Amino acid sequence: AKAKTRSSRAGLQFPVGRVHRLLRKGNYAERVGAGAPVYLAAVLEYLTAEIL
DNA sequence: GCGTACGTGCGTTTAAGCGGTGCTAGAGCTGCCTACGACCAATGGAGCGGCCTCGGCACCGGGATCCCCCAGCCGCCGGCAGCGCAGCGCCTGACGGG
Protein backbone atom coordinates (compact mmCIF):
# COMPACT_ATOMS: atom_id res chain seq x y z
CA ALA A 1 0.00 0.00 0.00
CA LYS A 2 1.05 3.60 -0.69
CA ALA A 3 0.29 6.64 1.46
CA LYS A 4 -0.68 10.17 0.46
CA THR A 5 -0.71 13.26 2.63
CA ARG A 6 -4.11 14.47 3.79
CA SER A 7 -3.22 18.08 2.93
CA SER A 8 -3.06 17.16 -0.75
CA ARG A 9 -6.27 15.14 -0.44
CA ALA A 10 -7.98 18.37 0.59
CA GLY A 11 -5.97 20.32 -1.96
CA LEU A 12 -4.49 22.28 0.94
CA GLN A 13 -0.96 23.27 1.91
CA PHE A 14 -1.09 23.58 5.69
CA PRO A 15 -0.25 20.49 7.81
CA VAL A 16 -3.58 18.84 8.58
CA GLY A 17 -1.62 15.79 9.70
CA ARG A 18 0.34 17.84 12.21
CA VAL A 19 -2.42 20.14 13.46
CA HIS A 20 -4.73 17.19 14.13
CA ARG A 21 -2.24 15.87 16.66
CA LEU A 22 -2.22 19.26 18.39
CA LEU A 23 -5.90 19.14 19.34
CA ARG A 24 -5.42 15.56 20.49
CA LYS A 25 -2.81 16.70 23.00
CA GLY A 26 -4.45 20.10 23.51
CA ASN A 27 -7.02 18.63 25.93
CA TYR A 28 -9.74 20.83 24.45
CA ALA A 29 -11.78 17.63 24.12
CA GLU A 30 -11.42 13.90 24.67
CA ARG A 31 -12.57 12.97 21.15
CA VAL A 32 -12.16 14.93 17.92
CA GLY A 33 -14.34 14.35 14.89
CA ALA A 34 -12.02 13.64 11.98
CA GLY A 35 -13.78 16.28 9.90
CA ALA A 36 -12.91 19.12 12.27
CA PRO A 37 -9.14 19.51 11.64
CA VAL A 38 -9.50 19.48 7.85
CA TYR A 39 -11.96 22.31 8.27
CA LEU A 40 -9.61 24.02 10.73
CA ALA A 41 -6.46 23.91 8.61
CA ALA A 42 -8.43 25.33 5.70
CA VAL A 43 -9.41 28.36 7.77
CA LEU A 44 -5.84 29.22 8.69
CA GLU A 45 -4.63 29.11 5.09
CA TYR A 46 -7.36 31.59 4.21
CA LEU A 47 -6.40 33.82 7.13
CA THR A 48 -2.68 33.71 6.45
CA ALA A 49 -3.26 34.36 2.74
CA GLU A 50 -5.33 37.43 3.55
CA ILE A 51 -2.55 39.31 5.31
CA LEU A 52 0.59 38.93 3.21
C1' DG B 1 -20.40 89.45 28.24
C1' DC B 2 -24.07 87.72 25.64
C1' DG B 3 -27.94 84.42 25.09
C1' DT B 4 -30.43 80.14 24.65
C1' DA B 5 -32.08 76.19 26.06
C1' DC B 6 -32.53 73.33 29.22
C1' DG B 7 -34.39 72.73 34.11
C1' DT B 8 -38.72 73.40 36.49
C1' DG B 9 -43.52 73.33 36.60
C1' DC B 10 -48.42 72.56 34.88
C1' DG B 11 -51.93 70.34 32.42
C1' DT B 12 -53.61 66.56 29.33
C1' DT B 13 -53.75 61.77 28.00
C1' DT B 14 -52.50 57.17 26.89
C1' DA B 15 -50.25 53.39 26.82
C1' DA B 16 -48.09 50.77 30.43
C1' DG B 17 -49.65 47.81 33.97
C1' DC B 18 -52.74 44.36 36.25
C1' DG B 19 -55.61 40.62 36.23
C1' DG B 20 -57.95 37.65 33.60
C1' DT B 21 -58.28 33.91 29.88
C1' DG B 22 -56.68 29.85 26.39
C1' DC B 23 -53.50 27.55 23.59
C1' DT B 24 -49.71 24.33 21.74
C1' DA B 25 -45.31 24.72 20.76
C1' DG B 26 -41.39 23.27 21.96
C1' DA B 27 -38.39 21.73 25.29
C1' DG B 28 -37.32 17.77 28.01
C1' DC B 29 -36.88 13.10 28.35
C1' DT B 30 -36.63 8.16 27.08
C1' DG B 31 -35.62 3.95 23.96
C1' DC B 32 -32.82 2.26 20.80
C1' DC B 33 -29.92 1.83 17.15
C1' DT B 34 -25.25 3.00 14.48
C1' DA B 35 -20.95 4.55 13.07
C1' DC B 36 -16.73 6.74 13.95
C1' DG B 37 -13.11 7.88 16.51
C1' DA B 38 -9.69 6.00 19.44
C1' DC B 39 -6.37 2.21 19.47
C1' DC B 40 -2.70 -0.80 17.62
C1' DA B 41 1.12 -2.31 14.61
C1' DA B 42 4.01 -0.89 10.31
C1' DT B 43 6.23 2.16 7.08
C1' DG B 44 8.81 5.59 4.56
C1' DG B 45 9.81 10.59 3.38
C1' DA B 46 8.52 15.16 4.72
C1' DG B 47 10.43 17.72 7.60
C1' DC B 48 14.34 19.13 10.10
C1' DG B 49 19.18 19.12 10.95
C1' DG B 50 23.39 20.92 8.72
C1' DC B 51 26.51 23.63 5.28
C1' DC B 52 27.29 27.44 2.04
C1' DT B 53 27.37 30.18 -1.61
C1' DC B 54 25.54 35.23 -4.32
C1' DG B 55 23.09 40.17 -4.23
C1' DG B 56 19.54 42.66 -1.69
C1' DC B 57 20.21 45.60 1.15
C1' DA B 58 23.26 48.62 3.61
C1' DC B 59 25.97 52.14 3.28
C1' DC B 60 28.38 56.12 1.26
C1' DG B 61 28.69 60.14 -1.15
C1' DG B 62 26.89 63.34 -4.03
C1' DG B 63 23.60 66.04 -6.35
C1' DA B 64 18.52 67.40 -6.20
C1' DT B 65 14.78 69.18 -4.48
C1' DC B 66 11.64 71.98 -1.47
C1' DC B 67 9.47 73.45 1.95
C1' DC B 68 10.36 77.33 5.35
C1' DC B 69 11.20 81.41 6.13
C1' DC B 70 10.91 86.68 5.58
C1' DA B 71 12.22 90.97 4.20
C1' DG B 72 10.85 93.30 -0.01
C1' DC B 73 7.42 95.23 -1.86
C1' DC B 74 3.15 97.34 -2.91
C1' DG B 75 -1.95 97.99 -2.31
C1' DC B 76 -5.02 99.21 0.43
C1' DC B 77 -7.29 101.84 3.57
C1' DG B 78 -8.30 103.94 7.51
C1' DG B 79 -6.64 107.15 10.83
C1' DC B 80 -4.99 111.15 11.01
C1' DA B 81 -3.70 116.21 10.50
C1' DG B 82 -4.33 119.87 7.54
C1' DC B 83 -7.24 122.43 4.33
C1' DG B 84 -11.24 124.14 1.94
C1' DC B 85 -15.63 124.98 2.95
C1' DA B 86 -21.11 124.65 3.81
C1' DG B 87 -24.42 126.17 6.63
C1' DC B 88 -26.23 128.88 10.39
C1' DG B 89 -26.85 132.29 13.82
C1' DC B 90 -25.66 136.39 14.73
C1' DC B 91 -23.99 140.46 12.96
C1' DT B 92 -25.20 144.25 10.65
C1' DG B 93 -26.59 146.86 6.46
C1' DA B 94 -31.03 149.18 3.71
C1' DC B 95 -34.60 151.47 4.47
C1' DG B 96 -39.05 152.51 6.43
C1' DG B 97 -40.74 152.65 11.11
C1' DG B 98 -40.39 154.21 16.00
Beta-carbon contacts of A13 under 8 Å, excluding residues fewer than 6 positions away, are: A7, A45
State the Cα–Cα distance between residues A25 and A46, nearest whole angstrom.
24
Stated resolution in angstroms:
4.0
Nucleotides of B under 7 A from a protein CB: 36-38, 43, 45-47
Which residues have CB atoms below 7 Å from chain B, the nucleic strand? A 2-3, 5, 15, 24, 30-35
From the list A46, A51, A50, A52, the residue with the least C-alpha distance to A12 is A46
Question: Residue A16 burial by CB count (10 A; 0-12/13-18/19+): exposed, middle or buried?
Answer: buried
